[PDB]
Amino acid sequence: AVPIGGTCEPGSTLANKTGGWRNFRPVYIYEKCTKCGICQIVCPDMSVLPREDGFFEYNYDYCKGCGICANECPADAIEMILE
Amino acid sequence: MKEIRIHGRGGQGSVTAAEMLSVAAFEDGKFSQAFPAFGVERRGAPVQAFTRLSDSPIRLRSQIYTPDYVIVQDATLLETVNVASGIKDDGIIIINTKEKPEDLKLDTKARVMTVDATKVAMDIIGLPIVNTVLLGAFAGATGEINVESIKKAVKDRFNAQAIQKAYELI
Amino acid sequence: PLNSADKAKMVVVEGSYAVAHAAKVSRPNVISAYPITPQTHIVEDLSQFMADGEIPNCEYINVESEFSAISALVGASAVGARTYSATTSQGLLLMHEVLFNAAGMRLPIVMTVANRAVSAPINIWNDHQDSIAQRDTGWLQLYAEDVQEAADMVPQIFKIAEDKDVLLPGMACMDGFILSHVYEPVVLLEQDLTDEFLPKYEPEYVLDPKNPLTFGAFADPSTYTEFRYLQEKAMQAALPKIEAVSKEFAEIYGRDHGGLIDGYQLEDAEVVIMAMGSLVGTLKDVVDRYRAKGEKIGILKVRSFRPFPKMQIRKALANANAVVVLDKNISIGTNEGALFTETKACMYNSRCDIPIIGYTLNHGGRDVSVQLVEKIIEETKKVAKSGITVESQFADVKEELL
Amino acid sequence: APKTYLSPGHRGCAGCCDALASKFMLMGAGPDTIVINPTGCLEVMTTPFPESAWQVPWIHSLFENGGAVASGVEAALKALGRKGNTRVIGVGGDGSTMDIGIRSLSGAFERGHDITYVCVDNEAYMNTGIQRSSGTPFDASTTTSPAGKVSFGNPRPKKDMPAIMAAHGSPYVATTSIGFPRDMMRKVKKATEIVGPTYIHSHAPCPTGWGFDGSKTIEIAKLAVETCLWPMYEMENGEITQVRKVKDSRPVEEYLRAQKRFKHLFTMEGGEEEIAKIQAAADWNIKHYGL
Ligand SMILES: Cc1ncc(C[n+]2csc(CCOP(=O)(O)OP(=O)(O)O)c2C)c(N)n1
Ligand code: SF4
Ligand code: SF4
Ligand code: SF4
Numbered sequence A: 001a002v003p004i005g006g007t008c009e010p011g012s013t014l015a016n017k018t019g020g021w022r023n024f025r026p027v028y029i030y031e032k033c034t035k036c037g038i039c040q041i042v043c044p045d046m047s048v049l050p051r052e053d054g055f056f057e058y059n060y061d062y063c064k065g066c067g068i069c070a071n072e073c074p075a076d077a078i079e080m081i082l083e
Numbered sequence B: 001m002k003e004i005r006i007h008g009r010g011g012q013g014s015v016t017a018a019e020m021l022s023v024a025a026f027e028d029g030k031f032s033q034a035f036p037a038f039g040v041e042r043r044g045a046p047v048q049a050f051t052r053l054s055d056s057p058i059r060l061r062s063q064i065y066t067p068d069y070v071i072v073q074d075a076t077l078l079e080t081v082n083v084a085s086g087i088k089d090d091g092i093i094i095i096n097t098k099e100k101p102e103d104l105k106l107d108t109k110a111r112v113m114t115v116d117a118t119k120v121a122m123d124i125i126g127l128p129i130v131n132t133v134l135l136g137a138f139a140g141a142t143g144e145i146n147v148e149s150i151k152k153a154v155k156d157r158f159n160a161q162a163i164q165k166a167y168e169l170i
Numbered sequence C: 001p002l003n004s005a006d007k008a009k010m011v012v013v014e015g016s017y018a019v020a021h022a023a024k025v026s027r028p029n030v031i032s033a034y035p036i037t038p039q040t041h042i043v044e045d046l047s048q049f050m051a052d053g054e055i056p057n058c059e060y061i062n063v064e065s066e067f068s069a070i071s072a073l074v075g076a077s078a079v080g081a082r083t084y085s086a087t088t089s090q091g092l093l094l095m096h097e098v099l100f101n102a103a104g105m106r107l108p109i110v111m112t113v114a115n116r117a118v119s120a121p122i123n124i125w126n127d128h129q130d131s132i133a134q135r136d137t138g139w140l141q142l143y144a145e146d147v148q149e150a151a152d153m154v155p156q157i158f159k160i161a162e163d164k165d166v167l168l169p170g171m172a173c174m175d176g177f178i179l180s181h182v183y184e185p186v187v188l189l190e191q192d193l194t195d196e197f198l199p200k201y202e203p204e205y206v207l208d209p210k211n212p213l214t215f216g217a218f219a220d221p222s223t224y225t226e227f228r229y230l231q232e233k234a235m236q237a238a239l240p241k242i243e244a245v246s247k248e249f250a251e252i253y254g255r256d257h258g259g260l261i262d263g264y265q266l267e268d269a270e271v272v273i274m275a276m277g278s279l280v281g282t283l284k285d286v287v288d289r290y291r292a293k294g295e296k297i298g299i300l301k302v303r304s305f306r307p308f309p310k311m312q313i314r315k316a317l318a319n320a321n322a323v324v325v326l327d328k329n330i331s332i333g334t335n336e337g338a339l340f341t342e343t344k345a346c347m348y349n350s351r352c353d354i355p356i357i358g359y360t361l362n363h364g365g366r367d368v369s370v371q372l373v374e375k376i377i378e379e380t381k382k383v384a385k386s387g388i389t390v391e392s393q394f395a396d397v398k399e400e401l402l
Numbered sequence D: 001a002p003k004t005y006l007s008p009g010h011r012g013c014a015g016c017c018d019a020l021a022s023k024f025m026l027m028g029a030g031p032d033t034i035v036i037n038p039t040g041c042l043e044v045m046t047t048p049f050p051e052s053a054w055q056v057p058w059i060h061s062l063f064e065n066g067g068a069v070a071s072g073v074e075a076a077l078k079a080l081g082r083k084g085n086t087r088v089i090g091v092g093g094d095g096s097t098m099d100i101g102i103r104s105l106s107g108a109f110e111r112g113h114d115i116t117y118v119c120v121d122n123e124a125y126m127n128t129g130i131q132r133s134s135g136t137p138f139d140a141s142t143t144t145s146p147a148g149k150v151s152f153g154n155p156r157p158k159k160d161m162p163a164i165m166a167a168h169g170s171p172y173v174a175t176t177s178i179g180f181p182r183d184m185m186r187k188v189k190k191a192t193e194i195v196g197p198t199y200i201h202s203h204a205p206c207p208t209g210w211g212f213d214g215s216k217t218i219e220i221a222k223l224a225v226e227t228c229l230w231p232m233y234e235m236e237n238g239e240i241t242q243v244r245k246v247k248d249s250r251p252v253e254e255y256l257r258a259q260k261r262f263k264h265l266f267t268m269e270g271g272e273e274e275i276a277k278i279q280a281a282a283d284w285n286i287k288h289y290g291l
């Protein structure tokens, strides 16, 4: 329903999965990862999630496959694959 | 009146396809109309464009909801977009894909037809510009517009061989 | 509107292209530009023409606001330049104060308006609220139905505005997206024809060091009324001017845009639909369907909104059994669109007491389908037979959202 | 990584510069903040009703009124005794900041409101389809300053907004870039913490508008700094106190070549001469800022 405003709830864009925008998809090569954390910083779509072990993982629900993380990785620990 | 819906992603020039279709149809002596889905085009985002064909001037100003023909520029769109939505039973869906029609499995009564298009583009043009090449496939699949008129349009505004191959392959 | 007989002369281009082309061919001396969806293609096209050196005796200004867009044209017009811009929506709203100023300065500035809804909430789609909200500013307002009309409207409105008996600025209104972003067959404006149709702007008094004069003086209560009276008088003069220029255009170009108002199957209509702009196209198709089934439905298109063609409308509605007025706007607090309000007002003191009802629709670009038009016609048919149930209403509210 | 307060699901292009700039801003500012966001890509892409990407309070009024709206927020917090350590932050594009919103901003700075203002400078009006703003650099092609038979694109230099805001007596003015995330976060954080009107000008390469692949947004940003076309510095009370030195500066061609909006300088007759004018701008930067 339209509220008097109309005010929106915070973080409600989660309802919009943008993973369907991808032509290419990033894939972590965990063996090559230095855990520097650059990929989490550089993601425009907050689709790089931290882990307790200090590695990172993708939220493919939202990843738009722009390839910035892959481009900025100093370890070439991310590969872009078609899809 | 015939109605055409084109599916693509921001940056893939779906509006140009719609425009070229309306230009080519008019060269054939059919009254035409073309327009983007009204909004802001985001790179990578699913987008739509539209064309109408008629023997008489087109005065209708509503959106297109039930197309006779559908063109899908990017196969990956099938996962998130209902491209067969609203299509007439005697309609045709043209899809840019390596796979053959039946492999795609779309819940529709309309004829599903496929061309690689992307490969045709990389082979002949060099770049993966599929918005114009798929129009060749459209002409071959539907017979609604002469393929020569589509060539005429693309050369006028600015490829023709890539249009020609797609016309054969469909 | 478009003449099918002209098929061999037509080309398929974007509406914005046709309008930009028409502006160029109309030979402005100063173009000002501020971008806003969905007006952008017009000014982009003009800037490309400038970049290719296609417009002689002309300067183009990329300003920093719409306020400056119109304000530059005030300065330029007063020097003697033919002036042009295009705007919409938030842009037109920002100009509000300068709109009053320009009309009061009696400067024949022309702008295309690519009608779009107004904030809040922000919305980039078609609605007539932007221009309708300017109905007091003293600008001419004409509403085009198609691309042909929208482009042709540019030279026409220059000729009207610049006429010595008028000297009022004017808006050539066309539906945002619907007309601005569509590609359709159109006859592009002819240069040599326009050079003969549209005389060069030759103002009697300008800013000129060799003939110093003062423009924009301060009027006390002893003279202000007379300025306002003369603006009204200028609008009165624009009534026959709009008819004359439309007829003259028809004679020169072979394209008849119908002047102040335009009837479609109107003469014997039991139910008359009134509307402005591109919606008329959809209406014509629906009317044809009703006509095919022998139902006496017709359209009265209002082309000139300012000046308001009261006498013309009154005469045109004389045989109707019921009138339905469609507005792409609403005066919040009245539940009525401006055309509905003004139609009733012009009909009030006449002997004709037929029911007139209103629907507001196309708010924030909400599509007007053939089926919605059919629903509205059916409701009005009932009114013709049985009387008014609801005088004014939103045609298509979603009660689920409340 | 510091927490950001922007959610996934926004409609930014793949590799969006506006998304990055706002993300870094929030990381520096923290959650005790209220954001004022004039019309533009950032606003449109994050707030399609009924959805919002913002995890902090956020208000959008109009295109022109960022400065004034932020002023009213700050004043209301003071009046109602709710100011505390809340950061009132305006975030807007080059067009909103430098062009249509400059009166609003001038008034807010002059009055000395405790606000922070962040300019996201992608050197054109992007949401509307890439039109020239005063943020547009010399000889950039835009849809209202296209290359043509008699045009090399935008004929004007970039307006110097940091200098303009310094002249307003702003206690803290800093340039930054999405190419240097940590730098941006640090500068934003500092700007928010100073009591008074502070200004951050962030360079933000737009893949859609500049014409480069979405994967290169950060790379292009770094290249702007390395060619010395974008000086990175801080001004405290109108005096430059810090500058990011560039020992190994790159010729401007390397930056210009990577972008469709400059392609015309490589195809048109006299293009190399125009490139020289841009090189001269970079050389001036080196001299003036002490790079
Ligand atoms: C008064 C007014 N004029 C024009 C517009 C149209 N408009 C909305 S956003 C925008 C461009 C925004 O450019 P910028 O501020 O640089 O942000 P960007 O989209 O580049 O991030 C324009 C021209 C408007 N909304 N209001
Ligand atoms: S940027 Fe590369 S090395 Fe660093 S954490 Fe991410 S994947 Fe690992
Ligand atoms: S590809 Fe782009 S959107 Fe996806 S995780 Fe990497 S940076 Fe984020
Ligand atoms: S045009 Fe540029 S700023 Fe706008 S959404 Fe796309 S990448 Fe972001």
Ligand SMILES: [Mg+2]
Pocket (backbone or CB within 6 Å): D093, D094, D095, D120, D121, D122, D123, D124, D125, D126
């Ligand atoms: Mg910008």
